Amino acid sequence: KSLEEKYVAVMKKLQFDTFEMVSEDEDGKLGFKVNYHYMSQVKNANDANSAARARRLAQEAVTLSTSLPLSSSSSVFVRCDEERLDIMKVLITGPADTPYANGCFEFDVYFPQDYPSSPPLVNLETTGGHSVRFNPNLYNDGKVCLSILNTWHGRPEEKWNPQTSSFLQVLVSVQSLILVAEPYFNEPGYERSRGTPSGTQSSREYDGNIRQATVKWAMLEQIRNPSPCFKEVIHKHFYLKRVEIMAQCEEWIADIQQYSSDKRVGRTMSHHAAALKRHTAQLREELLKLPCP
Amino acid sequence: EIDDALYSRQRYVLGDTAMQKMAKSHVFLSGMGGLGLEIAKNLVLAGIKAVTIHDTEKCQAWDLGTNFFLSEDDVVNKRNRAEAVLKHIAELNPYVHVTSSSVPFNETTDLSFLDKYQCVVLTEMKLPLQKKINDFCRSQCPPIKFISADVHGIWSRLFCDFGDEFEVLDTTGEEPKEIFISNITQANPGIVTCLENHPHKLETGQFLTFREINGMTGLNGSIQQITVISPFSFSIGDTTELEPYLHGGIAVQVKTPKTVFFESLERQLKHPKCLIVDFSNPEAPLEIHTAMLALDQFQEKYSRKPNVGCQQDSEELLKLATSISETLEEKPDVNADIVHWLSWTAQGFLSPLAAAVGGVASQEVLKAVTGKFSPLCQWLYLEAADIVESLGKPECEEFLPRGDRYDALRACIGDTLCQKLQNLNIFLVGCGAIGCEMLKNFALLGVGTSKEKGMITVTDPDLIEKSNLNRQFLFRPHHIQKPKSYTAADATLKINSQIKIDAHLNKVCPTTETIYNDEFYTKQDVIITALDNVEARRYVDSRCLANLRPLLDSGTMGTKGHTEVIVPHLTESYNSHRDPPEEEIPFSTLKSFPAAIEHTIQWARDKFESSFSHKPSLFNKFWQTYSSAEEVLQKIQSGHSLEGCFQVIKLLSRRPRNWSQCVELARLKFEKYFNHKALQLLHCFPLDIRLKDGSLFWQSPKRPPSPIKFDLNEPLHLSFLQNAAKLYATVYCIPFAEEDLSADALLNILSEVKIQEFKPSNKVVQTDETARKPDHVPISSEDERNAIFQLEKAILSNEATKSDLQMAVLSFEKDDDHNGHIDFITAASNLRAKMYSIEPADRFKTKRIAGKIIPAIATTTATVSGLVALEMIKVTGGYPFEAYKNCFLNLAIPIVVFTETTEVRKTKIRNGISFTIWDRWTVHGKEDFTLLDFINAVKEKYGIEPTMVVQGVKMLYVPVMPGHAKRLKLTMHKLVKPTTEKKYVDLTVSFAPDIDGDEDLPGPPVRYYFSH
């Protein structure tokens, strides 16, 4: 797989890097260069930083720079401010064989003043104006519900642990739990409807809606509105991977055509299929328009 | 009736019965020195029914250093001291009937009149007539409680005698313990195993009672004496004849009075029962006893105190002590140094030592009239010894009188040290009773009175309250709702006009660090704290550690207290203390399975705050986020996932419009809380449901509750409904009147109210003891459409105005009665107690627990303040490490323990290099100085190469971060981009650990001066 070889070779150099995200004025107040979520929290953060916080971040930095998962199924890309580590931004592509597949999702992360005593704040940025609850644990505004973040129910081993938990663990958990091929039954109660024909039918409905929303935002709006933090990286990734998506869109269109005949959920699959085919045509246009950086 | 609004904190210490006896007590005091003055102060603050003071002396200028009510006018008029200051003492408490007397006391003085009193305290008194008075006291029927104390220089004496037999009604104020029984056997003696994870925490010979025990129904209500087998098992005596054991059971501690025996004062002159406060000197108290007896004999022989530095007097006192030691039962070695120091400081007076001994003596007096705690038996000696030996051998002229009010202190510590105290700059945080006592000590000591240098600063953000008047003696009722610091400082100058003091209304916190910058801390010499929380302590500790200044702290709770001393380059920081965090009640236990009344009170408090603070905040924040309910309706119609909108709509659909509907909603809430929840939980868990092993689910500690049937005629129900209706009317801004609260009107309102029938549900129960409050279960579309219909109907009914989008948010007031928060919480807690068949609780313990009220008393604060003044004197002396003594105490036992402060540790960073918490490294450079030059300079001066650099919250350099080799070439000013405010900058640097993969070891903070 020459495509796989080049994919691994190129983005290896791009999975980690620093990038100044906050320009600084004369009086010590922060002027944010690009979009970010914790405007007021960062600006109001106390300047009495705990030394253990910085030391833990520095110790993490080695692993976070050397051991980022890299594969054509999914990869992680890591950027932080060139003068502050607690401001954080991460980009992830969707694992293959999922409704999320190859979709680019940007995150905002901030490490609290008491870190590592508490998990860092995590947030979705590819919300499309908070249009869609893309994952049952992932609210439309972007708020993240993970037991490791203490933002989801779970046993103590599933909770945040200042002594053992690592940011890389959260990164991996994103792919392993949120970015799955099976999001619908993750909603509490639907895991009981797993296997039931009605539950699986509603799962097909939800996953088709998620597929069309991903095609809209995570691919079409991402390429049409590239983010500065990964502008060259995303275009190179899309140039490399595009051969897959031009068939992924067609297979999804073929799947939703089978659903559309259904009288309960296929009626909504008709609207989602119209949206899907429109965005697929537009995405093919953009792929033809896509240059190689 | 007890004035609870003034005495709540004292009630939480003593108990109502002790004060009820206290309201029938007459206490007499003789001698009116500073010690007697403070005794009167503490007793009048405690609120004795009647106090009689006595004095045969007249005012002198020398008394101005020991009294904080006297004025120059009183000395000029040559008035009797007690009768002069009597008017001032009456200000402290109007309830106390304070009287005075001046009848001369001598060998022919009749003592029969003293029978009207229950306890008599003697100060400034000749020992033989003390013997006679003690003989009279214990010969009475019942005997009059006898207490005597003395203060002489840096030495003090305290003695107690309650006759041949005295009854202690309660040994200690600790709450009796209750323990679930896991196992118990029919044996001779029977063996009891408590809950396997819960420690027994009891001792052999104690008495226990038993309740709710299954198997042996006969053990219910029985009392046995126990014998500990293990920290989880014990024996209670024969139980073989009993019926077989089944399960459950609770053992409740039983308190028993104990008789304590006191010898006569004369008979205690030999073999005195002396309390020990320093285990390293288990003989010093006896030596001090011998020395005090020698001093008394010298005063008897020569009718005068020894002169300072008088070799003849010192030798005579040595001979007297040697002779007395020979007559003693044990004959201890006479301490020549102690005798020398006593002779040196015989004529002097030390007020902080007086403060400590007066506090402990007042606590003993309180014990004498209540029997609430085990008293001293029979002797206790306190010293300020460490001060004098640190000065070597000074001259007598250092202590000779000079005519001012400070002559008494000068004879004790010397003029130079007094001048040092006068020059000090002091920062004091917190204006509590501890702070007030410390300020009084400063004023009497001449602290900061130097017209040039000395300067005091205090600050506190709160105003004065009536409850504060019980222990903050500086204040008066006409000072309520006025700044504590301002009033305290204003009153201080009346004690001493020479003091120079400044005050602020500021809360010490990171935001106020601008006012209290590093330069301000450098201007200060000593920082003292009277805080009530740990976070502020840690903040002040960190600031003082950064500024390299000594810090003093003291904690006070009930009769327990402690003193913390922190000295630069000598001691650990307060942050070095790492006491275990409090473990809170399990979430499942709190919500679903309470067993303690504290669980129910916590549940009631949390429900109160959720209903009246949290949810109101959510509602108003929702209406601030979204302009109109129509907007939210449109958005949810388009599937917008707004937050809290469902709860806001549910509140609006439940919104009352008149008082009757508020009462209806309160009744519905009552039904929900105390009937429906029981039926739900019993539907999930039947009374006879069983576990994997077949044991009943409803077994200890899991109490199966029983649903409650409403009855307005029940006073508890009436109070609950009234308070809930009032709070809800405040919530919805519905006006009302007191007549609406009348029971008949409420019955009329509820007469037409239909009680909704219960229906079960299948909600999963978080039975996990390690569980926590999770996020909500996702909401069904049924609730979505129901709420949609609700706000659609509301809009159609015009219930969408801004007023409909408005409702009050209530703070948790805990002191006033009219707000009804305390009554509401008490009613809910008692309903929940009856709910789970747990015993109810009274209003005042509910107020204590819910408000987190720390019990307080004047005796403890005075005792700790005297000590604190002592170690700050030691700090002013610049004394070696050995002199500084931390202290812990618990007057309940009573017990006092001194211990040297914890030695500062050295952090071995690498290669034999070590540094302390007080260490801050320095580097000097220039504008062309670079980061590589910085690394070289560190590797040269301290022999270790930096591995990582941090600019505060910003990172400065990390080797693994991209392109940071170039930063080594950049100059300090270019890369820091500093302001012109400083000639330096502070950074954080760590170093590579000995084992790779480990975190870099943190070093001390480093300061790079921009110049040399």
Ligand SMILES: O=P(O)(O)O[C@H]1[C@H](OP(=O)(O)O)[C@@H](OP(=O)(O)O)[C@H](OP(=O)(O)O)[C@@H](OP(=O)(O)O)[C@H]1OP(=O)(O)O
């Ligand atoms: O949210 P909390 O104040 O912590 O308490 C809630 C609340 O009861 P209140 O309405 O009396 O405050 C719920 O009601 P809503 O907030 O939704 O109005 C109620 O749920 P239901 O209305 O569905 O009965 C729930 O009870 P439960 O957890 O048993 O479902 C109950 O919990 P607690 O009173 O035990 O805290």
Ligand SMILES: Nc1ncnc2c1ncn2[C@@H]1O[C@H](COP(=O)(O)OP(=O)(O)OP(=O)(O)O)[C@@H](O)[C@H]1O
């Ligand atoms: N950060 C702070 N800065 C200044 N003063 C503080 C700070 N934190 C607490 N205090 C003060 O500490 C004092 C502690 O004294 P005290 O024991 O009387 O407490 P309280 O809260 O007033 O009393 P109570 O518990 O009886 O209501 C308070 O008066 C409070 O104003």
